[PDB]
Every structure is written in C-alpha cells, then in structure tokens.
Ligand binder design. Structure first.
Ligand SMILES: [Mg+2]
Ligand SMILES: [Mg+2]
Ligand SMILES: [Mg+2]
Ligand SMILES: [Mg+2]
Ligand SMILES: [Mg+2]
Ligand SMILES: [Zn+2]
Lengths: 110, 146, 246, 153, 295, 166
C-alpha cells in the first residue's frame, strides 16, 4: 500500500517522542565494593571478571604449555601454586601448575 | 532523589535468611484450587467426570453493607490460597495486618443477603457444600494468547 | 554515488623539507640562556642591609673577568653604551611589558620581550584577565652580570645582562568567567627576580629586549591558589596490581 | 501456544540443538568453566547436572559408558570424567554447577552472557555476589530479635 | 530569667555564629594540606585541601558523586570524623559507608544522630508553659532494638501518659524534620562557652562538666542542625535525609530519688538499608520493650 | 558547514565586582562527524538531559546503544577540559544543561533492488553537542496539584471582563 498524504512533523514528533519509545532509566546501578567501579546488582562486575578471566587465560596457557598434545587429558586432579609456594601433602598426587607471579589478594590458598 | 530499587532479600545475610523464613436468600461462596480430573461411576452403569476442587485456605475478609455496595444484597469479601508476605503491596499487608491473617492470592466479592452475613476473619471448609447440589464455577480460562 | 570526504588534517615533518629551505630561518634571538647566575643563599638577609649589598654587588661587578670582557665587547660593537644608566631602562622595560600584558596589547610586547619570552607570558594568561600594578621598589635594581658569545657561522653577538630586582607588586588573575582565581588586588607583596635581558649587537636597530626569568633555588614558595586541586593516582589496567612506595 | 514446553528452540533444529549443547558440554567438561549466551548455558545446566549423575553410576555401567561416549565427543574426557569429576562429587545431591550472569559482550551484538562452572575447579574464584556482614545495621537489629527469641525459649 | 523560646534559640544561634566566626578568624591564611587516599578502591590519590576550610565532603566531590552519596564517615588515621567537619593537618583519609565489613562506627554515628533527632522533636513538640529538660543521649549499642533519649519534664505533667496518637504525632513531625534538608555541623567548644550555651538546663551543665572532666583541654563537641544545638561526643552522619524510616516506638518511666526521667525509644532505618514492611513491624514490636544500658 | 560551538568557549566575560554572586562555569563541547544516526543519537541525548555527570556516565555505561560509548567519551573529555582548562574544582559537581544532536554531511550511495531499479542510499553522519554547567542539577518540576489548578482557574474566572460592553 502507498501513503495517501505526507505525515507532518507534529504527528512525527508525537510518534517519536512518546515515552514507550524513549530509553528507560536503570535504577540497579551500584558501585563494586572491591574495585569501586560500576556494576548492576544482578550482574557480576566487569572489571573483576576481567581480572579473573585474564588470570584464567594465563593459567590455561601455561598448562597447555606443559602438555604437548590436544588429545591428552589429566587422569588426576590439578592444583595451582605461585612463586614461593610448595605443594602440600594433601595436594600431592595431583598435577602441579607453577606460576612466576605472586599469589593474588582475591585468590586464596585452599 | 534517585533512590535505587530494593527487595526483601537484598540486605539480608545467610545467617538471617532462615531466621526471617522461620426463601430467596443466597449463601457465601468459596475459593478453591482446581487439582485435576477423575472418572466416577453411577449405580445405573454410566460414567461421569469429576473435577477436583481443593479448598486450602478460605477466610472471609471484610463485609460491605447493602446500602454501600449495590442496594439489594450485601457484599462479602473472600480470599484464596496463602502467599508470601514479601511480594505483596504495602497497603495490602497493612490491611491484612489489621485483619490478622497472612496474605492471600486472589480476592473475590460475593453477593450475599443480609440474613447470611458472616463475621469477618472466619474460615470456611468444603463441607459448606453438601453432596448433591448445583454450583456455578467462575475462573480465568486457559489463555491462548493472540 | 561515487563521492568521498576530504580534508583530513595531519602534521607530518620530515628531514628533507626542513633541509631544503632556500632561505634559512633567521633567529633574532638565541634559544637557551648561556650561563645561569648562582646567587649567594643569604640574599633574603643582605637585601635588608644598605651598604653591604650595594658594595658587594659592585665588587662582583668590578672583579669579574669574563663579564668585563663581554662589556668591553659590547662597547666595541656599539658605542655610547653605559652600565650605570642601564638598570633604569631595564626597570622601565619591566614596567611597560607588564603594563602591556595588563592591557593585552601584543604588538608593544613584541617590541619589548623576545621570542623565547613571549609564549611563557602569553600562553596561559591570554584566556584570562589580569590587572597588574607597580607601587614601589624597596631596592634599586642591580646589574648582576653580562655575558656574550660570538656565533662564528654568521658572526652574531648576543649580549645578555642578568639584572636582579627587588620589586613590590600587586598581582591579580581573574577567571574568564570573572571570578577571582589567584591573588588579591590590594596586597603589596614583595618579590625578587633575576631577569636576563638581551640585545643583538650586529643588528643596526637592535632593541634592548627581555630574554629570560630566573628564580633563586631557595626562593620562598608562591602564594597558594584559591581553587582546590586533586592529583589523581595511576590509572590501573586489570592485570596490574597496585604497589605503594614508601 | 507454548504451554508445558521446557526445551527452547536453538540452532537449525532438534539435532542441531543437541549438537550445539553437546559441544558446550564437551567444552565445560574439558575446561571446567566456560562462558556463552545465557539461554544456551541455561539449557546446558541440566545436561551438566545429569552428566555427573550418569558418571556416578560407575565405570562398568554400559549405559553410562555409551552416554558419555556420545556426549563427550573428545575421547580423552571420558576417563577424565570417570576418574576426576565423579569421585570429586560424592556428598552433595544436586549442587554440581554454578551459573552466573556475565555482562554483555563487547561485540556489536550486545548479547546476554552467562558463565557456567563446576564446584571445586582449579581456577581463581569468580566475583560472587557477597551478602552483607552480620555487623551491618539491619543484620544486628535482626540478631537482637534472634537473641530475644532464644531467651524466650 | 525571662526568655521566650524564640529568643533563647536566637541566643544560642547568635553565640554559635560568634564562636564559629572566632574559629574562622583564628585561621588567617589558606594553607595547603596534603591528604593521601588510603581507600581500597582508589589508592594513591593525592588531595590538596585548604586548612580549616575544606571538608571530607569537598574531598569526595573531587572523586565522584558516588562517594558523596555513599560515604557517611571518614577515618583520618585511626579516628573517625564527620563528613562536614573541616580538616586540620596533612594526613591520610578513608571513607566508610554502611556497606563495609566493619560498619560499627557508622552504625554508632547514625544511632547518636537519631538520638539527637528525637531530642529535637521532643524539645519543640511541647507547650511553652511546661518545661522540657533534655538530659543526654545514653549510648546503648545497636543490638538493642531502639535508640533512647532521656527527658526531664514538668512536675504537673507526671500523671498522664502519651498515647498512640501522640507517638504518631512525634513520628509525623520527625518525618517533617527529615523532609527538609539540613546539614550536620560540628564545632569544638570550650567548656565555659558550652555552659553559657546551655544556660538553664542543669542536667546539660552537669553533662558538660562530666565530659570536660575526661579531657585535659576542657573541650566538648557541639553539633548543630537547623536551629537546634545539642551536645554529643564523637561523630555523626552528614545529612538529615539519610533517614528513610523513622518511628518513635515507646516511652518509659525511670525514677531516681532526685528526678523522674522519661526514656523515649524509637527505631529508624536508612535509605541505604531500608527493610520490608513485615521486617519493620517485627523490629518495631521488639523496640517497644525496655532498654537499660548506661555503663 | 558551521562551527560556532567550538568558538563559544573563547568568550571572556568582564571581572565581577566583590559582593556579586559567584558566576557558575559554562563548558561547551562538541564532536563532529559521528557515524551514528541523528534520531538514534537524539534519543541518547534526550536520556541524559538535566542529570549530573556521574549518573549520566552511569546510565551511558550500561546503555546498549553504539552512541552511548561516544557520548561517554565526549562527557569524560568535556569533564577533563573543565577540570584543567577552566577553574572547576569539584569535578563531580557538574550537570548536563543542554545536550542535542544535529545532522552532519551525508554521503549518497546506490541501494540495488531488482528489475533494473535502484534507490539512493544515504550514509548518515551526525554531530553531538553538550553543555556542562558547574553547580547542582536543577530540581525536576513536579506536576501541578489540585490546589494549584483551582488557583489558576479561579484566577481565570476573576480575569473575566464583560465583552463588547459600552
Ligand atoms: Mg498462554
Ligand atoms: Mg534461530
Ligand atoms: Mg541485472
Ligand atoms: Mg524520495
Ligand atoms: Mg532516503
Ligand atoms: Zn568490581
């Protein structure tokens, strides 16, 4: 179908400035207690998850460095230690992931 | 003041969440829960189908007089099954706090003659209906959308 | 349909066009100051004594060898030059340059101060409004020292006279929105400067110009600003942890 | 009408949906923590929960062996499951996995993201939403009520 | 003496502005003090404040409005200060909200703030023909259900007991006090000046004597919001509008051989930590009971 | 083209006499030739009108539009301009007084349809303008109460005169 008359700018303003087509405000914005950045209340902090993701990428790269095959997987459990740490007696019998940087404040020993 | 939104489970800690968790007259009708369907058989051999309506929590809530509601018959307010305190509205919890009962799901109005009035806050049971009678059933049907 | 945008402005400097100038750039004044005068550290206490400081400045005037050689070079290049009448001209050039800075007239300031001096006194202050007044001079100015160097590429001689002045000034800097920013108008604050002046000697016109401004290393700090200032810390990428030095 | 439907439409059909969720489950078993779209991870959570229950049935169970053979498409992960994941999950009944909502992707799609992981993995912990401490005002005021209730019994 | 309630408030207001102008004239020049930020979120930030003019609220305005809305107390070294109390020396600063793992000082400051607020309600909610003598704000910790203020009332008033309508009237003009926005101001006042401020109220003069006995410099802390001047040791909250829910729960009698005091007890909850209606009613049911802790 | 928003920052007012109220700062900033669309840009400009700069950046952080990042960068650089080049202490004490979007220079292309036909395809470029004023944000106007409506309508009746009278 073809339009019969040109829509005027008054009707166009009424259509395009109507509150259902406007961007609604978000009231769930909160400050992160750890880093002081911004996050939503039901969503993890992007800054903290970027830290966790980069450390996870470093761990995964260094454990892929130790194993030279794509089809070889560990039979036993994996533990990770940083510089200046030794494997515990309960951690023996598990494969060892050594990293040169110091252990983070957020990451515990366990 | 750009006040942020809040709920009941925001500021509560794990030690306190289970602490918080711990001839021409007409009769009064009921609010029940449709459980399911069953077969039934009669002594002449025929088979009918019965729908199961379970009353769980039925209480009369408030009484509206004859001259203030319709001018012919008074109004009795009946609530349904019991729901949570935290997801209802402030005025609803205030009026149920004055009434004395936990929050109900659905609230309905019954047209009742003045000789059948019931004092508010009174529970009701399925023995309100006797075996062998005819009833009218009102509900929101199965919504099939657009 | 086939049409594209133009005018993407960029500044690209290369060695070849800067070498291929048919006419070299002529600098009317040199860039750096040749030697920085180191004053005795008790000059805040000798300045309150009349006969000690004047005679001691005169003794450093008359006992220096290279300074007197440069002064002899200045009289030999240009006659009718006097050391004694020079501090009056230096004080008048200082007063007129600061008054032209008050009036925001740039052509008279081009005649007075030099190319190295001009952006340092224009760059931050031009978007602001200032009112400067000269009220007193507690001590008459001292010609501290005179230097020259002969650039043999063209035979150019630049005569620099470092002059010390103890000056009473009333300085106010106003914001472009009109509000007061730096200092009051009615306070006669005592200040000391070691201003180096310069004159090109080969130039037949060769106006006496203000070259540089020297503050003593032990000088008192300037008056505090009215506006409150935050210095933020280092911006941190996520896989870098903060370290606190001691 | 979508009444009583628990499986959402994904991929190019039911077979493509099963194959994509198989790929996601293989990646989750191999790496113990993966991020994807919210709906795919939400569908993946039930498969990852029942895969641990099938691994609990033992190495000698033929039905579980063929289930793991089909679902774990990389063949090294079946000994990895039966000798890592099943012995590690013994006590708890259904608390195998964690699902969290990641913020939107920095690509132009702005899709809604979720991360899925197993308990006890050898990875740095995610920034979990921590509750308020018990020294907070409302918690202390409610501990006062708890103390008066304990004093009333 | 013959002093109307308008003229007496005018008298403490005039003397407070005089003493404030004396402290303003005590600092002739603006001096730059270097404050380090030792907060966990933003370390290494260097602030350059004015001596005895700039406040930690003005410090937080340099960072963000998030710190201005959330921050309630400020630790300079190991001692908490008010958010509007001016800084004195070059130091290090940290901010505490309700949200932090150790919010105890903030909870105490909020608690004493509501005690002073209820004092403001009571000392203006009665007739001029009777006399209202405010005693003090006894510090019971947050584990109790209600904050309490001790009031000495008239000798002919001791018979009747205030009812639910009176308590909701106290709640109503308390919320009217919340609705208008008044900052909290803190000033260090010499003991004889505090005696001149408090004038007739002998319990207040005794409280100033007791608090100045513990300090060798004979100083006390005076806090002012709106037009009421009240004494409280330690810090308070910055703003009036931090309170969301306020209620004057219950009153109680306490008799000594020399005096009969009324203990006014109430419950409040902030904008940050507002609770559900049911939780608020349970806490209000708790707060009706007696609270007895002085030492 | 026209460039006046950049020129508006060069206006120097005369100094204020003592005793006068302190004049608030006004910071004019703009960014030209943004790839985003004019009306879609206008929606984001309408979102942040009258809000303070911190909550404006808070909303534009989590807005999913492409121009949200552009206005976020513009607001940060405008705040940076305000904190150094102007004498604005309390960098969080700014609000967005005026934010609007104009249209830039458009490029024409051919959009092919079929049956040998074609349509002209308009490459859309837009400008963004922002004005930051030092001071607290103005309070949002409440709707008129029934007392206010009664006051105006009784005043309207009291302003009645007898028409075509003498
Ligand atoms: Mg439906
Ligand atoms: Mg699809
Ligand atoms: Mg063709
Ligand atoms: Mg056309
Ligand atoms: Mg077109
Ligand atoms: Zn974070």
């Amino acid at each position: 179908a073809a339009p019969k008359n040109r829509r005027s700018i008054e009707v166009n303003r009424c259509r395009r400035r109507n509150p259902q087509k406007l961007i609604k405000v978000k009231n769930n914005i909160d400050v992160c207690p750890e880093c002081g950045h911004l996050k939503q209340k039901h969503i993890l902090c992007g800054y903290c998850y970027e830290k966790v993701r980069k450390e996870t990428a470093e761990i995964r790269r260094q454990m892929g460095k130790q194993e030279g095959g794509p089809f070889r997987a560990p039979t036993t459990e994996t533990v990770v230690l940083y510089s200046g740490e030794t494997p515990s007696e309960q951690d023996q019998g598990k494969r060892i992931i050594e990293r040169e940087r110091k252990r983070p404040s957020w990451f515990t020993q366990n | 003041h750009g006040k942020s939104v809040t709920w009941w489970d925001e500021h509560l800690s794990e030690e306190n969440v289970p602490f918080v968790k711990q001839p021409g007259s007409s009769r009064v009708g009921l609010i029940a829960l449709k459980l399911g369907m069953m077969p039934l058989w009669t002594k002449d051999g025929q088979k009918h189908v019965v729908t199961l309506l379970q009353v769980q929590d039925c209480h009369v809530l408030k009484y509206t007089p004859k001259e203030n509601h319709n001018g012919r018959m008074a109004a009795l307010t009946v609530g349904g099954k019991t729901v949570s305190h935290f997801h209802k509205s402030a005025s609803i919890l205030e009026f149920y706090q004055e009434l004395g009962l936990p929050p109900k799901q659905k609230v309905k109005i019954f047209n009742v003659t003045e000789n059948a009035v019931i004092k508010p806050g009174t529970p009701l049971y399925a023995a309100h209906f006797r075996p062998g009678q005819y009833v009218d059933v009102t509900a929101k049907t199965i919504g099939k959308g657009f | 349909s086939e049409k594209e945008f133009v005018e993407h402005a960029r500044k690209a400097g290369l060695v070849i066009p800067h070498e291929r100038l048919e006419r070299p750039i002529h600098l009317a004044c040199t860039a750096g100051i040749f030697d920085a005068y180191v004053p005795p550290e008790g000059d805040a206490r000798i300045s309150s004594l009349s006969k000690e400081g004047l005679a001691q400045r005169a003794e450093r005037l008359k006992k220096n060898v290279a300074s007197q050689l440069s002064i002899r070079k200045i009289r030999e290049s240009d006659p009718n030059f006097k050391i004694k009448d020079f501090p009056e001209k230096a004080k008048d050039i200082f007063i007129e340059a600061h008054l032209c800075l008050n009036n925001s007239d740039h052509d008279r300031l081009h005649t007075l101060v030099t190319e190295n001096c001009f952006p340092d006194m224009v760059w931050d202050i031009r978007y602001k409004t200032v009112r400067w007044s000269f009220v007193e001079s507690l001590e008459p100015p001292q010609v501290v020292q005179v230097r020259c160097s002969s650039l043999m590429n063209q035979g150019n001689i630049y005569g620099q006279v470092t002059v010390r002045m103890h000056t009473r000034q009333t300085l106010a800097i106003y914001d472009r929105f009109g509000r007061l920013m730096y200092g009051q108008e009615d306070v006669p604050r005592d200040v000391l400067e070691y201003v180096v002046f310069e004159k090109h000697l080969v130039d037949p016109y060769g106006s006496w110009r203000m070259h540089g401004k020297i503050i003593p290393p032990w000088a008192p700090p300037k008056q505090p600003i009215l506006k409150t200032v935050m210095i933020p810390g280092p911006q941190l990428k996520p896989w870098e942890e903060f370290e606190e030095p001691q | 009408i979508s009444h009583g439907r628990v499986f959402r439409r994904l991929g190019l059909g039911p077979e493509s949906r099963i194959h994509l969720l198989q790929n996601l489950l293989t990646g989750l078993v191999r790496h113990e923590r993966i991020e994807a779209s919210w709906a795919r991870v939400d569908e993946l959570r039930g498969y990852a929960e029942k895969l641990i229950d099938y691994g609990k049935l033992g190495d000698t169970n033929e039905r579980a062996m063929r289930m793991a053979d089909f679902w774990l498409t990389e063949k090294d992960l079946i000994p990895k499951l039966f000798q890592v994941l099943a012995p590690r999950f013994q006590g708890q009944n259904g608390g195998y996995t964690r699902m969290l909502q990641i913020p939107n992707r920095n690509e132009q799609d702005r899709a809604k993201m979720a991360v899925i992981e197993y308990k006890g993995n050898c990875l740095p912990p995610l920034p979990l939403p921590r509750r308020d401490s018990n020294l907070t005002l409302l918690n202390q005021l409610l501990q006062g009520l708890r103390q008066d209730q304990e004093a009333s019994s | 003496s013959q002093l109307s309630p308008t003229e007496l408030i005018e008298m403490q207001n005039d003397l407070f502005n005089k003493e404030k102008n004396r402290q303003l004239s005590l600092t002739p020049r603006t001096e730059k003090i270097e404050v380090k930020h030792v907060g966990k979120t933003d370390p290494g930030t260097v602030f350059v404040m004015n001596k005895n003019i700039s406040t930690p609220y003005s410090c937080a305005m340099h960072l963000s409005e998030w710190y201005c809305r959330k921050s309630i107390l400020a630790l300079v070294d190991g001692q908490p200060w008010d958010m509007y109390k001016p800084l004195t020396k070059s130091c290090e600063i940290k901010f505490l909200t309700f949200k932090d793992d150790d919010p105890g000082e903030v909870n105490k400051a909020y608690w004493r703030s509501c005690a002073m607020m209820m004092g403001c309600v009571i000392e203006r909610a009665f007739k001029d023909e009777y006399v209202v003598s405010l005693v003090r704000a006894p510090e019971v910790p947050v584990i109790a259900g209600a904050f309490c203020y001790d009031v000495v009332l008239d000798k002919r008033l001791d018979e009747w007991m205030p009812t639910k309508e009176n308590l909701h009237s106290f709640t109503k003009d308390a919320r009217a006090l919340i609705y208008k926005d008044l900052p909290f101001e803190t000033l260090e006042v010499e003991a004889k000046v505090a005696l001149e401020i408090f004038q007739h109220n002998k319990y207040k003069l005794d409280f100033i004597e007791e608090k100045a006995s513990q300090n060798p410099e004979r100083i006390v802390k005076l806090h002012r919001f709106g037009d009421f001047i009240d004494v409280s040791e330690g810090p308070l909250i910055p703003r009036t509008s931090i309170c969301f829910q306020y209620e004057v729960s219950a009153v109680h009698n306490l008799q000594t051989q020399s005096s009969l005091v009324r203990r006014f007890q109430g419950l409040s909850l902030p904008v940050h930590l507002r609770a559900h209606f049911t939780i608020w009613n349970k806490l209000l049911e708790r707060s009706r009971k007696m609270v007895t802790e002085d030492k | 083209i026209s460039r006046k928003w950049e020129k508006k920052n060069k206006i120097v007012y005369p100094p204020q006499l003592p005793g006068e109220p302190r004049r608030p700062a006004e910071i004019y900033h703009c960014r030209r030739q943004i790839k985003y669309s004019k009306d879609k840009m206008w929606y984001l400009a309408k979102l942040i009108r009258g809000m303070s700069i911190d909550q404006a950046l808070a909303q534009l952080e989590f807005s999913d539009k492409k121009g949200a990042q552009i206005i976020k960068e513009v607001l940060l650089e405008a705040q940076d301009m305000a904190v150094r080049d102007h004498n604005v202490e309390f960098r969080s004490n700014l609000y967005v007084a005026e934010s609007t979007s104009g249209r830039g220079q458009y490029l024409k292309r051919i959009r092919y349809h079929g049956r040998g036909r074609f349509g002209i395809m308009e490459k859309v470029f837009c400008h963004y303008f922002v004005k930051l004023v030092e001071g607290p944000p103005p309070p949002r106007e409440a709707p008129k109460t029934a007392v206010a409506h009664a006051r105006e309508y009784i005043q309207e009746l009291r302003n009645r005169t007898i028409t075509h009278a003498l």
